[PDB]
Each structure stands twice: as C-alpha cells, then as structure tokens.
C-alpha cells in the first residue's frame, strides 16, 4: 500500500535524471493528486516541464486507472542539495 506508486516514481526519475530531476513523488490528497518533481537546477523552461508533466499524468491515469473527474496536477521544485531550502518553480493546476 505504502509502495503503490514507487515503481512508477522510479521509472519517471530514471527517465528524467538527465534533465536535473532528482526525485519524483505521487502526492495524493482529498481533492486531487499531484506529481511532485524536484530538480537540482533551474534550467528547465515552463514549456519543457509542462510537456514532462502532461506525459507523466497521462501515464499515471492509464496505469492506475484514475477516472477523468480525478484532478491531477504537477509541481517542479528546485532543491540544490540537503544544505539548501526548496524553491518552487512551477505549479501546474489540477486538470
């Protein structure tokens, strides 16, 4: 149960590691689900992130069977390392 999304997260991490992504988390709450990406840099444009997020959300929905009425969004954070506080770059609104 705790590991429901782990394999999926690991797959996405491995796919986007070359783009500075260091962690991926499927974060579910009452009103929606977000895929939370953490990068070690600020190089990705919004348009680039938006494409990565859109594909990951499509994949999430198909893989876990999330109905069309389940809002899903995505977040890109910049966290350089464990010595540095998180800064959020983009939040794509639950669609």
User: Which residues of the shown chain bind Na ion in the complex (CB under 5 A)?
Assistant: 9, 23, 25
- Residue among 18 and 69 whose Cβ is closer to Na ion: 18
Smallest separation, CB 83 to Na ion (Å): 20
d(CA 86, CA 61): 27
Of 13 and 70, which has the nearer Cβ to Na ion?
13
Q: Which is nearer to Na ion, 14 or 45 (CB)?
A: 14
Residue 6: in which H helix or E strand, if any?
Answer: helix 6-16
Least distance (Å) between residue 58 CB and Na ion: 19
Q: Where are the beta strands (DSSP E) in 1-95?
A: 21-28, 33-39, 72-78, 87-92
């Amino acid at each position: 149960d705790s590991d429901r999304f782990t394999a999926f997260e690991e797959e996405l991490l491995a796919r986007y590691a070359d783009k500075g992504i260091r962690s991926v988390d499927v974060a579910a709450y009452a009103k929606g689900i977000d895929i939370v990406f953490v990068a070690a840099d600020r190089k990705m444009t919004r348009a680039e992130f938006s494409a990565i997020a859109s594909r990951s959300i499509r994949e999430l929905k198909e893989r876990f069977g999330f109905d069309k009425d389940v809002p899903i969004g995505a977040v890109l954070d910049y966290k350089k390392d464990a010595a540095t506080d998180t800064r959020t770059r983009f939040v794509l609104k639950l669609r």
